[PDB]
Amino acid sequence: KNVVIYADGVYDMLHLGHMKQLEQAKKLFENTTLIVGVTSDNETKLFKGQVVQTLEERTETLKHIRWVDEIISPCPWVVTPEFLEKYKIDYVAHDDIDIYAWLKRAGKFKATQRTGVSTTDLIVRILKN
């Protein structure tokens, strides 16, 4: 009954938003292995705006999160069919704002939601000085 779930992301400056999202992935089913994939710095910088924390900083932080069973660091930018087989992943867990069409067609896409909980927020609170 153990189901493998895979959640990839930049995971820069992990805040409660990410943690809630990982808890959710982890609890999609009764028995799970949550695998998390962490984008390389190169790919993030070149496809995403930037990256504050290095791969090793973002990965070490995820190590400490209760919902994380396994880390793939760095992970590929785009999940592929072959990547699913290689790692016996049953579902991909990610938010949905269509890159995930083929996953939804397969029944292997579980959506996860964001939640005002970011470091950026916290500073606003501080600089009320």
**Which residues define the annotated binding site?**
10-11, 18, 48, 95, 115
Pick the closest to residue 110 from 35, 6, 30 (CA basis): 6
Residue with smaller CB distance to a second copy, 54 or 80 = 54
Binding residue positions for CMP: 10-11, 18, 95, 115
The string of DSSP letters for 12-54 reads TT--HHHHHHHHHHHTSSSSEEEEEEEE-HHHHHHHSS--SS-
| Residues from 72 through 101 that contact a second copy (CB under 8 A) | none
Please classify residue 2 by burial: count the beta carbons closer than 10 Å to its beta carbon, then call 0-12 exposed, 13-18 middle and 19+ buried: exposed
Instruction: Confirm if 9 and 30 have CB atoms less than 8 A apart.
Output: no
Number of residues that bind a second copy (CB under 8 A): 22
Binding residues for phosphocholine are: 10, 48
Least Å from the CB of residue 70 to a second copy: 13
Under rule CB under 8 A, residue 65 binds a second copy:
yes
According to the binding rule CB under 8 A, does residue 16 interact with a second copy? yes
User: Which listed range, 18-26, 41-49, 91-99, 105-113, lies at the site for a second copy (CB under 8 A)?
Assistant: 18-26
Q: Is 61 in the site for a second copy (CB under 8 A)?
A: yes
- Euclidean distance between CA atoms 53 and 12, whole angstroms: 6
Tokens 């962490």 belong to which residue? Answer: 38
28 belongs to the binding site for a second copy (CB under 8 A): no
Which of 19, 25, 55, 71 is close enough to bind a second copy by CB under 8 A?
A: 19
